[PDB]
Design a protein around this ligand. Structure first.
Ligand SMILES: [Ca+2]
Lengths: 97, 94
């Protein structure tokens, strides 16, 4: 279809739409063994914000910035409201969505 | 109160038009007629204020305090309000 499927023998599957979208399928053999921006796979969604330092935080920005590969990379800041910074698009967006 | 018309509020594809006696506001900003923007044309004549929307509507606020709306036939069976559901049958569905 519109998807490119990367299949692995370890139980991990990837679907990529050749664009910003990516879907990662994990077998139930990796529960509690994974980490990163995708959570830790232990059926609990509130502790998925665990940082690289192994601490669950309430700030999404801090949890996301803790997972950057390069420590020298600048931290991400809070973005503006897309429909407030660009109101002239807002109507179209709604009419499109 | 005479049964005068005080305010007419129009939402036309993201454009907000407020018509009051001696005032026309577009998106909260007073405008000078004729005013064309985003496919909406507002113009004042000796007897009426006309708002034409290219999506297919015409609104007339006359000086005898009459508000007349004319709609494109593509909106039939898809409207609601004091003007009915626009399906060609007077009583049913209203
Ligand atoms: Ca979890």
């Amino acid at each position: 279809g519109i998807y490119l499927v990367v299949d692995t023998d370890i139980g991990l599957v990837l679907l990529w739409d050749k664009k910003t979208s990516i879907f990662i399928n994990l077998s139930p053999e990796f529960k509690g063994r994974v980490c990163g921006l995708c959570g830790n796979f232990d059926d609990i969604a509130v502790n998925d914000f665990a940082t690289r330092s192994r601490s669950v935080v309430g700030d999404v920005l801090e949890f996301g910035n803790s997972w950057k590969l390069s420590p020298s990379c600048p931290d991400a800041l809070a973005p503006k409201d897309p429909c407030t910074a660009n109101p002239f698009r807002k109507s179209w967006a709604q009419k499109q969505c | 109160q005479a049964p005068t018309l005080s305010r007419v509020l129009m939402k036309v594809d993201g454009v907000v038009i407020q018509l009051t006696k001696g005032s026309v506001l577009v998106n909260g900003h007073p405008v000078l007629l004729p005013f064309s923007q985003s496919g909406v044309l507002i113009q004042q004549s000796s007897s009426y204020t006309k708002v034409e929307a290219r999506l297919g509507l015409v609104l007339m606020w006359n000086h005898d305090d009459s508000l007349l709306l004319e709609l494109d036939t593509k909106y039939a069976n898809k409207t609601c309000g004091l003007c009915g559901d626009f399906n060609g049958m007077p009583v049913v569905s209203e």
